[PDB]
Each structure stands twice: as C-alpha cells, then as structure tokens.
Symmetry: D3
Subunit: 246 residues, 6 copies
C-alpha cells in the first residue's frame, strides 16, 4: 500500500512584544505524529510531503503520482498547489497540480482529505477548496465562507452506517473539539456523523475513490479520547484500504 | 446594575519600514475608556474584562456569570471565546464560553453587542459570530461575509421609535462613520436606524433581554460628535437598564 | 481624442521576514506593477497621472471638479478599503468626503471608469478588495461573487473574442494566454467582448452619462503573461478601451 | 513590605505558515504568576505592572514612587520606560521614568533587576540599559552589545559569600540555562556566581540599596529545578527585605 | 539653490491583535512635509526622494547628482543606499550610491545629515553609517552601537558659537525630545550643542562642505515648539546655504 | 570524504501591502543547492542539515559528529544551535551543540564557516558568534557589531598565498558583492584576500583544522560569475580536503 501524504507542516514565526520592544523566535513543525506512526506500524508505506515541498517540487506529470494507491491531503490549502514558487515568483507556465490530482483520481487513484484550518474551506476560508477544480472531485459540497465548527467542550462522532466495512465492529465513539462543516453529496455514502453533520464520507470519481474525514487526525480538534480510542489505527488504515487503487 | 464588559482592548505591533530597513514599536490600548467612565458616572458598576483576560481566565461556571445584570461584548471576535489558551495551546477540554453566555441569557441575563471591526461579522468577517452558537441569541440576522458599511463622509442616526423608553426625549442625533449591516429579526424591536439599516435593536432570548448597537461606541466609527453628544450616557445607561436582569 | 487619464493603484510595499532557524532578518521592498503598461499608454499618446496606492491614503482629491479633468479613471490592484479608509479617516478622527462616492459622481456626470483584475481588484484574494459591498458595485458592468473570486490557471488559458467586430478589438488576432482572472457575471445590460474559460474577460457598460469597462484579468504578472505584454495588440487593447469609454 | 514589580509580561503574535498561506494566533502571557503568588503568601504587598501598563500609566511623581520599599524590573527594556505612548505617539512632553527611578533610589528606595532577554543589554542588546541614565545606578557594568550567555546544558549557581544574610543556609544550588554577562563594580558585594560571572550582586546608590540577579526568575533560563528549589521563595523574599527602604 | 532631499518616508504595517484574532492596516507617511514647505518658501529648489524611491530608482551616475548644490539625508539608513532592489533581488552589479555621494561631496557638493532612528547609528544601530564608506565624509565620529539619547522630559538647544553666520540673531532655542550622540571631529565646528553633546556641526570634505544636525527635523524628537520656532526656516535655509556648492 | 553541511535554508513570510490592505505569501527556500550538487559531483559525501532540522534533530552525541570528516556552517546563526526547540519551548536541559562542535574539532574534526548575514557577526550582529563558545575555534577575530562590508559595485578576490594547496593553479578570480570583515589570528594562514581584508583563512584548533571563507557561497554576495567560475568546485572541494580529518 503506497500512500502519498501531503501537508501537516508549518513554519511559525513568533513576535514576542514586551512593552515597546520585541524579539522573534522561529520554529518548524510537522503535525501528524500519532497518525503517521499508527499508519507505519499498520503496514502502510508513506511517502511524506511537507507543504513547502509542494511549492518547489510537486510532480509535473501524472506518471509520478500513478505509483500511489492513495493521495492524502491534510492542513494544506489549495493556494499551495496552485501557486507554486515557479508560478508566483518565477513567471513560469506550469502544470496545474490540482488538475494532476484530478486526473490521478479519474484513472483509479484514491484521495483522502482530512479536516483542519487549512483543509476544505478552513480558517477565514483560506483553504479555498470550493473555488477550485478539485471541488468536483470531492464527495462533499463545501460552505461559501469559514466552515469551522468550534467545539472546545468536545462532541462525539456517531456511526450512521455501523455495518460499513471501514467501521464494522467499532464502538464507544470518541469526542472531537471541532470539524469543517460540509454537506455530503447525495450520491455519496455517509458513514460517521458529528453534531448533525457528516464526519466520514465515501464517494467515487470516475475510476477512483474518495473519502473525506471532516475533523482533524491530530490536535487540537483531534482529542486524546480519539487517539487512544481502540479503533483509531483501524479507522485510518481501513479508510485508505477502502479507497486504494486496485 | 452590575455589568461585565468584554473587549475593547488590543495589542498593536507596528513595523515601520524606511526603505530597506525597519524598526518596530508595540502598544497596548483600550478603546471604550470614555464609555466606561460615562457608565460609571451614570451609576453602573462595571467589571472590565479585556480580550486577553477572556483567553486566560473566562469564567467556567454560569454561577460566576449569573451575578451580572448585563454582559456587554464589543470589538472581540468569537474566536477569542472559543479558542482560549488552554484550548488552543495546552490541549485542554474547556467549557464553551459562548454556550455559557447563551445559558446566562437563557436564565434572565441581559446581553448587549456593540458593533465594530471585531463584532458581528466585522472586517474580513473575522469576528465570525454568525457561524457560532451565539448567533441564535442575538435580535439581528448577520450577513455571510464582511458586513462593514464604511461612511467616511458620515451619516446620521435616525429614531424610528422616538417614543421607545430607551430613546425618549433624545434629539439632535449624531453622525457616524460606519456600522455593521445586519437584519433585525422578525420578532425584534428596531428603535434606531442608520442609512435605513438597523442601528439599535432590542429582543428576547427565553428569560433574557438582548440588544445590538450596530455602530461603534468609540472611534473611528463612533465620532467625536457622538461621544460628546448630550444623550450619549443616557443612550448607553438606558439600554443596559432596559435589558438588565429583572 | 486627446485623453487625460488618472491611473490608480499597481503599487505595493513588501515586508519580508526571512527566518533562518531561530533568527530572522527583514528586508523591505517597494515595487510598482504597471511600469510597462504606463509606458505603452505614454507612447500611445495618453496623458497619464499615476497615483500609487499610498498616494490615495495621503492625498486622494476631495473635489469632484478635480476629478472632472480626467476623461477616464483606471483602478488596478487597489482595494476598496484604501479609498474608504484614508489616513485622516482611520487615524486622525476627521470627516472626509467619500472617495468612492466621488468616483461614482464623476462617472454619473460623464467620466469613464476602467477596473483591471487582480488580487486587490473586484473581490480578489480572500475577498479583501471587497468592492461588492461598496457604493461602487452599482457602477460596474459586472456582478461580483460573494467571496474570493480568483480563478487560478497556472497552466494558462487564452482569451477569446466573442464580439471580434467590436471597435475596441476589431482586427486583433492570436490571443495570448493568461494565468488567472477574477470571476464575475456580466450585467445582462452590458456588452461582453472577450471571454476567458467561458467567463467574461472584457465587458463594456454605461452608468448614467459615463461609460464603464472591466478587464477581468491582470495587466501585469503573474496573471498577465510575458506573452500578453509583448502581444502585438497589447497597446491597442488598453488604448482602444480607454478611448471607447472616454468622456465626450 | 511594599513592592512595585514591573514586567514579566508579553504579547505573541504567532504567524503560522502552511505552504503559501498563513493564519495567525495571538496571546498575552504573564511569566511570574506563581512567584508573585508566593511573594504575596510570604507577606509581600505587590503592585504588579505588566510592561504595557508602563507605556500607559507610569508614576510621574517622586512621592508616588516613594511609597514603595522596593521596585523590581524584570524582562522589560529601557525603551518601554523612555518611550511611553504619550511620548512616542501623542508627542507630549513627560517626566522621564528612568530619571524618576534613579531619583527614587537616591531617596532611599530599593531596586532589583532580574535578568532575561530584555534586561541589562539582552538579546541583540535591545534592552539597552547601558546607554541610559539608569546605568550608573546599577551595581554592575554591562557589555557593549548582546550580553546573553546561553547554557542549554545547564550550569549551577555557586555561593561566594555563603554567609551573606540573603543566602545563609541555602544549599543544593539549582541549574540555570543562561544569564546576562556583566562585571561587578569594585564597591559591590558579589554573593552568588554563575560560570564564574556574577549571578547575585548587591550595591548602593546614595541612600538606596540595589540588587542584580543575572539570570531569570522564569523559564527558560530559570529552570524547573530552580522554580521548585527550596529557598527559591526565600531568595526573593530575602533580597527584597535586604534592599527595602526601612 | 538646488537641493536633493532624501528620506523622511516610511510604510507602517500595523498588526492589531484583539485576543485570538488580529486585523491589519498599512499606512504610508512622509515626515518632513512641513520642512519642505518652509524650505521652498525660503526659495530653496527641492527635489524630494522618498526612501522607497532610492530602492527603486536611485541615480546611477554622478553626473545626475551634480545638478545639486546640497544633498540632504534624513531618516534613511545606509542599507537602503547599499542594497537597492537590483542588487538585493535581481542579482545585478551596480554603482555604490554611498560611493557616488562621497564622490559628489569630494568634487564640491554639500551634504547635510539630519538625526533620527535611521540616521547616524540610530535605533539598534540599524542605520549603520559608521561601518560604511560615508563615515569618513562626516564631521562627527559616531558611537559603536545604538546612539540615541532619549529625552522625553525635553532639553533645549544651546548656541556655543552664536557669532556663526548660520545662527546669527537666533534666540530662545526650542526643546527637543532626543538626539543622536556623536563626537568631535577635531577640525570641525560645533555651533549648537544639546545636553553637552554636539547638535549642529559643520566641517568639510575635500572641495565639499558638510553639516550634521544631531536631532530630528520632525517628531517626536523635533517638537512642535521647534516646528513653530520663528528661526526654524532660517536654521535649515542658512545651514543649506552655508554648505551649498561654491 | 564525509561532510555535514549545516544551514543555507530559510522560510520567507512576505507581507504585501497595497494601500490599507495586505495579503501574505510564504515560502521555504534552500540557498546552496548548486554548491551541494557541485560537491556531490566532485566526490564529496554530504549530509545536509537545514537550519530547522538543527532545531529538532541535532546530534546529542559527540560520537555522532565524530563520523564526519568536516562540518560546514553557513548562513545559520549561533542562536539556532544554542536554542533548539526542547531548550526554548519544552523546558528541557540539552547538550550544547556549540560545545559539541568545539569538542569535535578539538579531537581532529574539520570546521569550515562560510560568510553571509547569519554567519560570523552578520546583519545587525545577529549571528553573534563572537559572544559564543565557538569563537575561540575560528581562525579569525570578529568585529563587535555588524561586520558586513557591502560592495554592490563588485570587488575581486585576490590570492596572497597562490602556492597554497587549496588554491594552487586557480586563476581569473571572480567578483564578490560583499563579505564579513574579520581579522586573521596571528597563528593562522590567510590565503585569499578581499578589499585587503581576509577572504580565505586556515587554522588549527588542537588536533583539528579550521577554515573560514568570509564571503558567501551563494547570491547575492556570491555572484553569478563566482558560481560558474571554473575553480568554484575546486575551491570548496580543495578546502574541505585540506581541513578534513586526519
């Protein structure tokens, strides 16, 4: 099982202001710690690609993407795919990464999007996925502005399709502190809900298969109850297996 | 009258660029110093909670809140309540501040929202109140995006209910330089208008009474003329009095 | 025939924070974005006043009589906030005439208005240009989207003439590629002359005595390609459209 | 014992860049809350002043300052004192706070400076105390530039006068992760050292007693070992008592 | 009298953090609008070159600079001259603007430098002129770091050579709120001092004449008193006339 | 030949202000991709550690560094080595990276420092190496502040020891757009000069060998002329060999 995992990286610039003055500290992080560990011990072969790597060296032809059984996109916005460094600074004409991913799915590849501030529409609608060529590929329809539902008190998932292969045999469903609100396309399969909204949704796109998980795999939307839940590793392994190219 | 007044505080970081170079200066400031003085001189006992205080120490129990007759919210966005520091950084599960306020009004508490860049939807829709559980509490319906109406040339408030107890006897209404555009709910009372949009609106949410002032109590939208208006204190005192716990 | 045009916008001030591990140094960079275009209009006989964004903040004309001297006003890559929230308004507590009202009255009374697309035009990036929620929306011959209205095409797509006999574009050929545009809907009132990805690209209208135009992509990179800049009809396009909508 | 404790507060300013895009996060924090609570529980009456308050509301009269037995300055640079908002933005003439403090010590009051990134010279020499009218008041002589000594390995303190009233009885000296490098003046008593540099130093300036602790009372220089060290509270209580106006 | 006036412009990026959220406003200002009016009213022919214009369009050859009798440098650091856009971003090799200026003074041109945060050494020594090829042209010797003397209390200027043609028949000198501290030079003439440091200094460099005014022509160091002083226009016109190309 | 190459990486966050408004674009870049490729093709086996990796994963063990024949430090400041994430954010005691590097060289390892804004002292003295435990290892003595010499007009390298093994045979020396200014130690060998200042210096520290190259390997200081100079690879390959363990 060959998986391309894109995103879950950030560069924080901190300005510490003390009265009149300030000094800065800068940091690089990667965010999918418990998830990529769970996937690796679960038999998945991950090629990890940080957001900044998309900007410099996203594959220019579909053949390179074709080796992957699933592509995962998490906490990385459409602007990163569409406005690669060569496009935005170097005045080049470049192949469209999102059309590439679209073609990839058309011809058999799986696609998962995991929720977050830079997934779907996201914080201040920055992820902007709705207004891109990738919107039609996805089994949910996005809202037109900021789509976050913030639940700092926590709220739990429900199985609505408990007999579905991905979640059959699961129970005692965990709690989340937020998600992106979207509306499942009506030909899609909703498997888990949250707060009267979809949480886990499967669809199809020509030959390929699609999944959306509307919450996060890590903090803060993903809680301790979530990552310690007996069925955490199986959720992500099972969803990738379900949508993998055959 | 005991009143909790939340917001009207900011930390400015200024980056001054002179050609190639830049130096910084930083500045904390409070915005409704005049208003709070007028309210205290009109006999109101005010507990002032600046925005950073919400982040560190917002009351977790409705019992703490129930000792207030009115809570006022001005220039502080929904994210500040929902994403407190223990939530966003320390990975804690925290009671929901907006639910707490919602519960407080439910049980006889009065709620005022004052307009500004960080009220209602606000600049770039950053206040984002429409997409929250507090939306249902307010006597107005907000727009889906940035809801500012900028009027640098100034427009007058107009009284469409000159007889309303809160505004009775006022005259010579002042000029404002902008407001948040919203739609008064069907069951709410429009007392004042601005550019024919609602300006002062009153309503109910179970046992509690609600109010929205659609422009600012402070500059630049709340003008010098507004702040030194004879009815300025009356306006604000009368409205707290009107929606106070009975 | 002899055009006096006010060209507003097409300037910016980048602050760059260069983070190297723990540390950062900064460099700050002014640029102007339409030097090429302005040179072409100069050579094509247009009398141009250039007003960068910062100059609208300090010194936008308060008098309509002062605007009335211009045959056309061009707005490009400058947001509505810049016009509405001049320094005296936002910092200095003054009442001040509304720049967008002034522009509106200038059009009502026979002035021309051209808006050129970009990140700080129409709605633009993150909807910051925000023109739909301003008193200028009714003046334009297009209806904007409710959010971010960019269509990014890194692979490029070419413009197409849907009214190739229209005076402005008559005789043009070999239309160039663009890397993006602002998506809008033409008023069913207006004349769509060029399209891009089947969306309007060049649109003409009227507003009381004045005449209006919208070009939905950029005059400059990255949306305006080098191919577009050196396209044989670049000059005539902008010159003809200025001339089409000019006062008289 | 009546003490004016200045500083140990900051606002960050977090820019989170995920590929092309970024979103921001902001928080105010206070660094010495438990220390301050420990001082109050140990009989010290504290007026606490976050750095931003210094810019808004610093005492202009000598008589106001004279009511304090000690003033403490921690992680707030000279610019904050010299460039209050009325000076830097409001273009008003106003009393010099550093002259006020210097005058306060002449008249008998105690002064302690705790090290950190915005004490002494500090990071990029931004604190800049050496170039101010307060330099002559301090019992140490500062470097010409950035005076940090970073010790991420840790280094333990050392008593050179273990018999001094302030540190008599103390034992098991904890580690620090750094300090500001300076030189004790000839007329000054060095009580603790750090990597052979002064760590704790007492002196006099006319009637007033003075003190410098060269590391931080807080993270990260003040280690967890230091926070929890028996005598940690005693160090602070003792040095305050020692330098206090009687 | 033909004069090139460089600097006195900045672009400010303001980050207004209201709790979790922040909004931004950017602001361009020119700082010597008043000075330039006074100078042109004194019949000086001024070409004004903002800092950003130096970045983008500084004259490449000395011929163009020689149309000026004096060059004035105010609140623009040496990095702006040394690191123009083509140099720093476009990989081009180009003429050294600081060398050009120095050559200009060498062959008759006059040079005045006016103090500020981006003059001489300046705030955090960012202006950095001491470490440049221009330092030897100036009739003062700078300090090795931050050279600001901050005087929010105010200090008046004092004439030590009232007989000098520049200040003849000036009296009642205004207050200033700070200045850059420098020394000497031995063969230079100090006309005004400030807090016993030089304020207005004249010297020469080969054929050209030089001047340094150590404080600001503008706020906040240059107070509104100074701005409204009857000899404000006379000071600047006389200094310019005194150093103009003979 | 086994070489650890550290630095030459940065994340840019760009704030584009157009009038009142701004949008942001961010990008990670690497600056020595060319050099690294040249060195690979020239028989050097490189482990490349970008700055952010030093913050997360710097060899705690002196035995880890001992596997390397040379360590190269370029455009990365002392602070990054000293203030790794677990030091600065988590509150953990860590081995001192600079002490490790010193021990490493002391025991026979090679050390090359390449010039730029975040080397030696650098821009605003930010690299700060002079005030660290690594300073005594380097074969040069650094200035006390900003040590840049900007030469936008270009300046040639010169050979002063043409017969030195590192440069023997080189000719037609390229032009540089700047360098850090330092002074060679008496016991060290100066092989190349720039503007009469040292450009290439070799030394020893106990068993180990040291090199310093005072200009940049990359733009803008390192011109296109330098980078495509026939001896470009030989310069770096030769210097690595000359200082290699041993």
């Amino acid at each position: 099982l060959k998986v391309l995992f894109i995103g879950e990286s950030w560069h924080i610039h901190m300005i510490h202001s003390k009265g009149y003055d300030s000094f800065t500290s800068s940091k690089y992080e990667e965010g999918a710690t418990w998830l990529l560990e769970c996937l690796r011990k679960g038999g998945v072969d991950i090629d990890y690609m940080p957001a900044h790597t998309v900007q410099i060296a996203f594959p220019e032809s579909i053949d390179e993407l074709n080796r992957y059984d699933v592509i995962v996109i998490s906490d990385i916005g459409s602007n990163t795919f569409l406005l690669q460094n060569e496009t935005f600074y170097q005045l080049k004409i470049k192949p469209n990464a999102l059309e590439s991913i679209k073609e990839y799915v058309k011809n058999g590849g799986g696609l998962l999007m995991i929720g977050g501030y830079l997934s779907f529409m996201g914080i201040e609608a920055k992820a902007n996925y709705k207004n891109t060529v990738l919107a039609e590929v996805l089994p949910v329809i996005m809202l037109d502005g900021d789509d976050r539902v913030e639940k700092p008190e926590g709220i739990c998932a429900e199985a609505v399709s408990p007999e579905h292969p991905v979640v059959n045999g699961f129970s005692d469903y965990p709690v989340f502190l937020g998600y992106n609100q979207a509306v499942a396309r009506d030909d899609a399969d909703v498997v888990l809900t949250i707060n009267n909204d979809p949480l886990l949704v499967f669809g199809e796109y020509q030959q390929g298969k699609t999944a959306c998980f509307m919450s996060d795999c890590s903090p803060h939307w993903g809680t301790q109850q979530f990552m310690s839940w007996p069925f955490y590793t199986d959720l992500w392994v099972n969803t990738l297996q379900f949508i993998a190219r055959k």
